[PDB]
Amino acid sequence: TGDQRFGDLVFRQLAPNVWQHTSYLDMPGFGAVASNGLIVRDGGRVLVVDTAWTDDQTAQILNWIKQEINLPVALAVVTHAHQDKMGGMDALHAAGIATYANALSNQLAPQKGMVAAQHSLTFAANGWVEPATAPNFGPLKVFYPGPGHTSDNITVGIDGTDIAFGGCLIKDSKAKSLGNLGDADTEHYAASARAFGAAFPKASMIVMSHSAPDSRAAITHTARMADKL
């Protein structure tokens, strides 16, 4: 499917069954902020990681899925309670899609003027999602690395691929900053970035919220910036 413009979004194929979705927030005076999530074809169903910034943009994701894949969307997982990741929850719910987030994300969501997911994930002491809370996730491997970008940030690996999703936790290997630290846990950030690397040690493609996918150098670089906080 390549790189493709569809509506106001960009879709980029990462692997035979994995695509990155990109949507943009206009901040009047400063132009457009990209946010990336994922689309996974898991057999005869589709799995979404993160919404777009808005309901309309998130409906465009669903329309692209219908046009390009023509398989039903079984579920979505959202990686923390900010607008770039949970802005479009209502569009998923209107389409009848089961939604999942960290229990703490669902507690924070309404306080940040957003809609909670339907289901709450909980995590073992080692950071892996408790399987009873993540029924039928298939290849999606969900990990809580500890607080960093936010207290609630979660991360996802895709079994059967070399791909892991750091979302807003991880920055690219040439980044000059850690991005948006408005809600960050600066004391815990470095260890949480390293914990994400340790959870997905065979990943060679690191997908993140506001940069193109990178090597494992993204993880090291992120942790080293966070060591200076």
Applying CB under 5 A, the residues found at the interface with Zn ion are 82, 168, 179-180, 209
- In the block, which residue shows the tokens 């029924």? 135
Cα–Cα dist 220/74, whole Å: 34
Spatial CA neighbour of 36 closest among 157, 211, 223, 173: 211
200: partner contacted, choices Cl ion, Zn ion, none (Cβ within 5-8 A by kind): Cl ion
Q: What is the largest CA-CA distance in the chain?
A: 47
155/211 with CB nearer Cl ion: 211
Pick the stretch among 28-36, 62-70, 189-197, 206-214 that binds Cl ion (CB under 5 A).
206-214
Could you give the 3-state DSSP secondary structure of residue 36?
strand
Q: Which residues of 109-134 are buried (b: 16+ CB within 10 A; e: fewer)?
A: beeeebbbbbbebebeeebebeeebb
13: partner contacted, choices Cl ion, Zn ion, none (Cβ within 5-8 A by kind): none
Shortest Cβ 45–Zn ion spacing (Å): 27
Shortest Cβ 119–Zn ion spacing (Å): 20
Q: Annotated binding site, which residues?
A: 80, 82, 84, 149, 168, 210
User: Read out DSSP for 157-192?
Assistant: EETTTTEEEEETS---TT-SS-S--TT--TTTHHHH
82: partner contacted, choices Zn ion, Cl ion, none (Cβ within 5-8 A by kind): Zn ion
133/180 with CB nearer Zn ion: 180
Cα–Cα dist 104/5, whole Å: 34
59/144 with CB nearer Cl ion: 144
Pick the stretch among 19-27, 68-76, 106-114, 160-168 that binds Cl ion (CB under 5 A).
160-168
Spatial CA neighbour of 106 closest among 122, 92, 93, 95: 122
Number of residues that bind Cl ion (CB under 5 A): 9
Q: Interface with Cl ion includes 146 (CB under 5 A)?
A: no
Q: Interface with Cl ion includes 151 (CB under 5 A)?
A: no
Site for Cl ion in 166-205 (CB under 5 A): 168, 171, 179-180, 200, 202
35, 105, 192, 211: which one contacts Cl ion (CB under 5 A)?
211
Pairing type for strands 163-167 and 119-121 reads unpaired
45, 66, 93, 210: which one contacts Cl ion (CB under 5 A)?
210
Q: What is the binding site for Cl ion (CB under 5 A)?
A: 168, 171, 179-180, 200, 202, 208, 210-211
